Design a binder for this molecule. Structure first.
Ligand SMILES: CC[C@]1(O)C[C@@H]2CN(CCc3c([nH]c4ccccc34)[C@@](C(=O)OC)(c3cc4c(cc3OC)N(C)[C@H]3[C@@](O)(C(=O)OC)[C@H](OC(C)=O)[C@]5(CC)C=CCN6CC[C@]43[C@@H]65)C2)C1
Ligand SMILES: Nc1nc2c(ncn2[C@@H]2O[C@H](COP(=O)(O)OP(=O)(O)OP(=O)(O)O)[C@@H](O)[C@H]2O)c(=O)[nH]1
Ligand SMILES: Nc1ncnc2c1ncn2[C@@H]1O[C@H](COP(=O)(O)OP(=O)(O)CP(=O)(O)O)[C@@H](O)[C@H]1O
Ligand SMILES: Nc1nc2c(ncn2[C@@H]2O[C@H](COP(=O)(O)OP(=O)(O)O)[C@@H](O)[C@H]2O)c(=O)[nH]1
Ligand SMILES: [Ca+2]
Ligand SMILES: [Ca+2]
Ligand SMILES: [Ca+2]
Ligand SMILES: [Mg+2]
Ligand SMILES: [Mg+2]
Ligand SMILES: [Mg+2]
Lengths: 341, 54, 429, 437
């Protein structure tokens, strides 16, 4: 009989993982403050990692990697990619970003130096400002309007002016991939991703057709649910569109770059967060968000440390978590693509 | 990577390696707290012996 | 040296107390004449905790035998180890107590208590550093219950900084049929709540069930019951009589086991449960560990799964894997973590002694401070109230000068004790 | 030459002190009777080992040590031990009844009756000192004497020796070998009252030592003797700079200068390598780079914590044996590019290094194998605050219900000292998070 505690009630993914563990008859749920657990489904903020691995006779496992916030915060991600030699400032798959602190509190001068080079060079000079404290996003071409909005920590990155637009619709989208890193730091990519598509045509000259968020497309967008159910296009439909419209495949034109970016990010922080020789073990589910331009180039947007799943894929993904990340440590009585490294 | 202040002798040696530059109460107050605690003990024992006398 | 002074009062107290000295004398290699004949230096390393040394290298139990009638103490003196006790430590009257707490506490016992305290004082003066006292007695009778609790109160007056520990035998209608035992027990429990640091609840109800149901003793005797008591008393005092790190003296035991001063009533447990003259198959460490926590091995008729453990002490005896003991102990806490309060971290302590008891390759003794002990006090309280609501049989006590208000207060204190266990059973972190 | 006096309080302090002074004698070649044949200045001198040993006209080398325990059965082992002739009875102080795992009993009730005798015996050793540096205090966090009497003694030492340094070797409680449920209470009470009186304190978690003994020495159920022999090796590595010729950490003040920039944050994390079982008939001798890299593995630390998720304020490497500065500088360079070593901005990312050519001495018949080179890293990292957080959480769980509190109030202590001690610890955790995050 294995034991586990639950310290995050709002986790739709791990609420189902909890339901699956109890349904096995070999897992018992304890009170949230009972220290004699095998598994902790911890909270998002201030998880007491320092208290794990100090129970005699108990192998303890937690569903979060301490230090993974370096990859899952806006300002942290930019600083990580710029300052890590494994990723370097010459990183080709991450949009040119700059960390901007409000003046009431930095890379302001460096942000303007590369900004004037675009105005002088007759190049597309459209940027976007955002932060980890969002629902507040501004998309402007004048840098004077971007810096004024931050003062009212944010990051400014280059806005992909030429995105890949699905037809019919001439509409934007983004790709969400679910990645599971186990206690051995094996990197597993869930075979099923989702395209959170826009239902409005992209107007290159309003932030409804530009921001592909599921909440914004269900509010400000008038054509919600027209082309696809819930503005969620799955891999089978998207692979068929790429074959019929572009004579390519999802695997060749996009997924190779996606798997490459996933490996590069997680291998970069492996020495800092690995629990290999530690007194407790970690795993974590990550949500990677990508953009594809018209030339079928994949760009990384951000990484989510506490991702939510799509309704159709909850049952299969949460079952794979138990099989690969939980029951691998606690055996009882493949939907993932292993990204070897 | 700079080694500075290398000191040597017969039983060993010591040095410093720099990889990057940088970016009470008195005895009177003690006895007053000790005696104030002993006073609380004697008071508690006195209330017990009073209780037992009843 | 940290000496303990032992007192046994009344019939039950003297019979159980005599078996205790008989059992630990054999464990420490002392013969009925007080001469050491053992073959191990561990038997003598802490011998001074319970014995005094005399001329001719004689070891005399630091024990005081008290009764208001000479009957049982004549049986002790003529018993197997009767010649080992100090003759001047036999303090006895002639009237008896008539199973009357008031006679033991207020009239008959008052006449004899001063001569007992003189023997106590003589023993306590020849102690390098006395740690405290242990008393054996029943709560259902008159001498052990009434005079025993009078002795505890007067000893506490003279030695208010010493530990008071009792082995208190709770009455049961399955064993005795004297109707006033719930009165005597309730009056005694009120005394114990206030004037002892640790009380081992030895429930005749549980001893009967073990003997009758488990050992298949269809005609149980007190010798059968006292066999369980002797093994348990040996087990819970092992940490006092042999070298060890855990709960080596009475005060360190109390600090570990008593989180709130009134909740100091322990459920003892023992494994393996054996009858006199009965052991071919040796018990394994997993078996000892599961049995010592089994409700059927508890010496108090309380279901541990109906409450929560505040603190637990576990003592393993015999030659065994201390690694395996740790593994099995950790397994119980990790597989039954709901029955342990979470607001007392690491509340289970384990000791191991290489010297096993007589006739057993290995054994385990359980000491639990569980909120389930409220079931014992609820049982006595219901028997008390059934009679007291009609003042039935009260004239036996008012005839000795007692007032009904003293019964109301004892009843209220015991119901308050039950409420206190109940509040720490529901508390949460 | 400047003398150091070691003070051993309670069972843990006395049994560890016994293992240390046994090891000190083997390292300096001092016989059980106190005779040191290699000492040519009979009856005196100012060699480096004289900081820990005094000398008599007959050639006996006597530890500058005081043993205190409120109960005599542990110190009686020293009075009849192998090295009984080293000490004179004036150095061994015993009471009759211990503190019963009760801080308040050791600090207020029983401490008040023996504090004056201990200070007098300490003053007798101080009078033999031409230039006393200060004191090294060995005690447990969990016992009533180790927690309660120590904090009382440290307050009096700060009064009677206001200019002398005071260093601690403190045993942090671990349930695998602990003997009291209230040890989280005693640890936080003694840390609160000793904090302003200690200049540098080396915490040793019994859990870390226990697992190192199980993992690396193949001991199924380590005893105190197993743990104390390993602890004495770490203590020996730390004090070697005071007893031998050298230039790093040559006096007690230099410990605070090299390791403690902020006075309250004076708990350096110790890491030791290698720990090799003597049961192995042959073992591959690890290189300078291998033992230095092991200093950044949590399984070799004296307190389990993750220094990757904190910041360093200082770091010292203390090598013993076949070690040359060339191989050290290379190992540090390799490690800096592979490990997550972050210093605070107001400190240089650097390492103070000391090398002692004499290889580590092991006790004959012990569990540790002889090695050609070993290292003890002393790093002041904010990650050690994980141990304060674990301790404070156990405190909070019990104090929320006032469990066992009556044992302390009954000894004269006020319930307000509990919350006052806990608020001080909460301020300590806040200091650590500011420096390290
Ligand atoms: C361990 C001490 C002990 O020997 C334990 C029991 C009783 N006493 C005295 C000896 C004794 C017992 N029975 C006796 C009959 C006549 C004379 C003496 C006895 C004793 C026994 O050995 O039975 C074979 C016994 C007695 C009882 C006994 C069990 C018992 O031993 C098996 N009881 C459980 C009760 C009893 O009241 C009861 O509730 O039984 C269900 C039981 O009632 C019945 C219907 O049997 C009974 C039987 C005499 C009736 C009236 C009141 N008393 C109170 C205790 C109880 C008994 C065993 C002391
Ligand atoms: N490493 C090590 N730890 C010890 C040793 N002895 C005791 N301890 C630890 O110290 C704590 C108990 O404190 P003690 O030092 O034994 O008690 P004390 O200082 O003598 O105080 P008293 O309560 O009066 O007995 C527990 O955490 C033990 O695990 C020892 O010899 N070595
Ligand atoms: N540099 C960029 N170029 C083009 N589009 C961009 C962009 N940065 C953001 N976007 C658009 O904005 C949308 C929302 O961005 P973002 O992911 O930062 O919000 P968010 O992080 O709060 C939602 P989630 O947490 O699910 O990722 C993206 O889906 C994308 O369509
Ligand atoms: N376990 C046990 N209980 C006993 C023994 N003798 C008496 N009792 C119980 O004690 C109670 C009677 O008290 P008793 O000691 O005989 O009266 P006292 O002499 O006035 O103290 C009843 O509940 C009996 O069941 C005994 O030897 N062993
Ligand atoms: Ca008379
Ligand atoms: Ca000399
Ligand atoms: Ca000072
Ligand atoms: Mg986000
Ligand atoms: Mg009788
Ligand atoms: Mg002690």
């Amino acid at each position: 009989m294995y034991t586990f505690v639950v310290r995050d009630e709002n986790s739709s993914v791990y609420a189902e993982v909890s339901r699956l563990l109890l349904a096995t008859g070999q897992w018992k749920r304890l009170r949230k403050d009972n220290p004699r657990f095998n598994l902790m489904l911890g909270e998002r903020n201030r998880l007491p990692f320092g208290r794990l691995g100090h129970e005699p006779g108990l192998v303890q496992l937690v569903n979060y990697y301490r230090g993974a916030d370096k990859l899952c915060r806006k300002a942290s991600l930019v600083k990580l990619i710029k300052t890590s030699p494994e990723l370097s400032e010459s990183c080709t798959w991450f949009p040119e970003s700059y960390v901007i602190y409000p003046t009431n509190l930095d890379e302001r001068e460096v942000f303007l130096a590369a900004y004037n080079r675009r105005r002088e060079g007759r190049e597309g000079n459209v940027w976007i400002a955002k932060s980890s404290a969002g629902a507040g996003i501004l998309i402007s071409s004048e840098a004077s309007e971007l810096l004024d909005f931050i003062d009212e920590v944010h990051v400014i990155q280059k806005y992909l002016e030429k995105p890949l637009l699905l037809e019919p619709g001439h509409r934007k989208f983004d790709i969400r991939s679910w990645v599971l890193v186990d206690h051995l730091y094996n990197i597993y990519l869930y075979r099923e991703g989702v395209l959170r598509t826009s239902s409005e045509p992209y107007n290159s000259a309003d932030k409804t057709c530009h921001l592909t968020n599921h909440c914004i497309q269900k509010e400000y967008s008038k054509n919600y649910g027209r082309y696809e159910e819930g503005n969620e296009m799955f891999f089978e439909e998207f692979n068929q569109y790429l074959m019929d419209a572009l004579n390519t495949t999802l695997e060749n034109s996009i997924l190779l770059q996606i798997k490459h970016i996933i490996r590069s990010c997680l291998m970069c922080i492996e020495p800092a967060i690995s629990t290999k020789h530690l007194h407790y073990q970690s795993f974590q589910l990550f949500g990677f968000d990508f953009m594809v331009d018209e030339e079928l180039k994949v760009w990384l947007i951000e990484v989510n440390g506490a991702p939510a799943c799509a309704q159709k894929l909850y049952a299969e993904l949460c079952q794979g978590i138990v099989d690969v990340a939980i029951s691998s440590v606690f055996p009882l009585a493949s939907i993932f693509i292993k990204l070897h490294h | 990577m700079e080694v500075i202040e290398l000191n040597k002798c017969t039983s060993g040696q010591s040095f410093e390696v720099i990889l990057k530059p940088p970016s009470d109460p008195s005895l009177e107050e003690i006895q007053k707290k000790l005696e104030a605690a002993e006073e609380r003990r004697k008071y508690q024992e006195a209330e017990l012996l009073k209780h037992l006398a009843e | 040296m940290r000496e303990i002074v032992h007192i046994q009062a009344g019939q039950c107290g003297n019979q159980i107390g005599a078996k205790f000295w008989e059992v630990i004398s054999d464990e420490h290699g002392i013969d009925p004449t007080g001469s050491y004949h053992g073959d191990s230096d561990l038997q003598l390393e802490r011998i001074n905790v319970y014995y005094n040394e005399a001329t001719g290298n004689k070891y005399v139990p630091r024990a005081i035998l008290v009764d208001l009638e000479p009957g049982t103490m004549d049986s002790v003196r003529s018993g197997p180890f009767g010649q080992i006790f100090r003759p001047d430590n036999f303090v006895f009257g002639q009237s008896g107590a008539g199973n009357n707490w008031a006679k033991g506490h207020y009239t008959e016992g008052a006449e004899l208590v001063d001569s007992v305290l003189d023997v106590v004082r003589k023993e306590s003066e020849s102690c390098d550093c006395l740690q405290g006292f242990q008393l054996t007695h029943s709560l259902g009778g008159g001498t052990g219950s009434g005079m025993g609790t009078l002795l505890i109160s007067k000893i506490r007056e003279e030695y208010p900084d010493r530990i008071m520990n009792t082995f208190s035998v709770m009455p049961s209608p399955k064993v005795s049929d004297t109707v006033v035992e719930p009165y005597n027990a309730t009056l005694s429990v009120h005394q114990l709540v206030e004037n002892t640091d640790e009380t081992y609840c030895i429930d005749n109800e549980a001893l009967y069930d073990i003997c009758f149901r488990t050992l298949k003793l269809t005609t149980p005797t007190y010798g059968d019951l006292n066999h369980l008591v002797s093994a348990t008393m040996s087990g819970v005092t092992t940490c006092l009589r042999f070298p060890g790190q855990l709960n080596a003296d009475l005060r360190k035991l109390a600090v570990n086991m008593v989180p709130f001063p009134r909740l100091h009533f322990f459920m003892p447990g023992f494994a393996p449960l054996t009858s006199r003259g009965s052991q071919y198959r040796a018990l394994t460490v997993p078996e000892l560990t599961q049995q010592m926590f089994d409700s059927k091995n508890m010496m108090a008729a309380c279901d541990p799964r109906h409450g929560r453990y505040l603190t637990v002490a576990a003592i393993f005896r015999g030659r065994m894997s201390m690694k395996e003991v740790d593994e099995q102990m950790l397994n119980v806490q990790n597989k039954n973590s709901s029955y342990f309060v979470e607001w007392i971290p690491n509340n289970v302590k384990t000791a191991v002694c290489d010297i096993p008891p007589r006739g057993l390759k290995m054994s385990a003794t359980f000491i639990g401070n569980s909120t389930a002990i409220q079931e014992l006090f609820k049982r006595i309280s219901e028997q008390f109230t059934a009679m007291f609501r009609r003042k039935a049989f009260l004239h036996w006590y008012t005839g000795e000068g007692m007032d009904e208000m003293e019964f109301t207060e004892a009843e209220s204190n015991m119901n308050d004790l039950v409420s206190e266990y109940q509040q720490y059973q529901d508390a949460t972190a | 030459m400047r003398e150091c006096i070691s003070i051993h309080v309670g069972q843990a302090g006395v049994q560890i002190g016994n293992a240390c002074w046994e090891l000190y004698c083997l390292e300096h070649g001092i016989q059980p009777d106190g005779q040191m044949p290699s000492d040519k200045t009979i009856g005196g001198g100012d060699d480096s080992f004289n900081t820990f040993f005094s000398e008599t006209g007959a050639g006996k080398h006597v530890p500058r040590a005081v043993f205190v325990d409120l109960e005599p059965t542990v110190i009686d082992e020293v009075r009849t031990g192998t090295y009984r002739q080293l000490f004179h009875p004036e150095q061994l102080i015993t009471g009759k009844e211990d503190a019963a795992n009760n801080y308040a009993r050791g600090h207020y009730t029983i401490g008040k009756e023996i504090i004056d005798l201990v200070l007098d015996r300490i003053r007798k050793l101080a009078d033999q000192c031409t230039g006393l540096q200060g004191f090294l205090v060995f005690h447990s966090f969990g016992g009533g004497t180790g927690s309660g009497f120590t904090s009382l003694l440290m307050e009096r030492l700060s009064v009677d020796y206001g200019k002398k340094s005071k260093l601690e070797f403190s045993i942090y409680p671990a349930p695998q070998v602990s003997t009291a449920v209230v040890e989280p209470y005693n640890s936080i009470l003694t840390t609160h009252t000793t904090l302003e009186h200690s200049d540098c304190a080396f915490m040793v978690d019994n859990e870390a030592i226990y697992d190192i003994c199980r993992r690396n020495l193949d001991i199924e159920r380590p005893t105190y003797t197993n743990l104390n022999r390993l602890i004495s090796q770490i203590v020996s590595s730390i004090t070697a700079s005071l007893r031998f010729d050298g230039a790093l950490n040559v006096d007690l003040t230099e410990f605070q200068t090299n390791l403690v920039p902020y006075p309250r944050i004076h708990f350096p994390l110790a890491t030791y390598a290698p720990v090799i079982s003597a049961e192995k008939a042959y073992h591959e001798q690890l290189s300078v780079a291998e033992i230095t890299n092991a200093c950044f593995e949590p399984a070799n630390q004296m307190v389990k914590c993750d220094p990757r998720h904190g910041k360093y304020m200082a770091c010292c490497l203390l090598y013993r044996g076949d070690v040359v500065p060339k191989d050290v500088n290379a190992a540090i360079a390799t490690i800096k590019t592979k490990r997550s070593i972050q210093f605070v901005d107001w400190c240089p990312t650097g390492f103070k290094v000391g090398i002692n050519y004499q290889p580590p001495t092991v006790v004959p018949g012990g569990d540790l194998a002889k090695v050609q080179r070993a290292v003890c890293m002393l790093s002041n990292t904010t990650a050690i605050a994980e141990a304060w957080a674990r301790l404070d959480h156990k405190f909070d769980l019990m104090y929320a219900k006032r469990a066992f509190v009556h044992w302390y109030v009954g000894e004269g202590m006020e319930e307000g000292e509990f919350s006052e001690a806990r608020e001080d610890m909460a301020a300590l955790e806040k200091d650590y998070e500011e420096v390290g995050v």
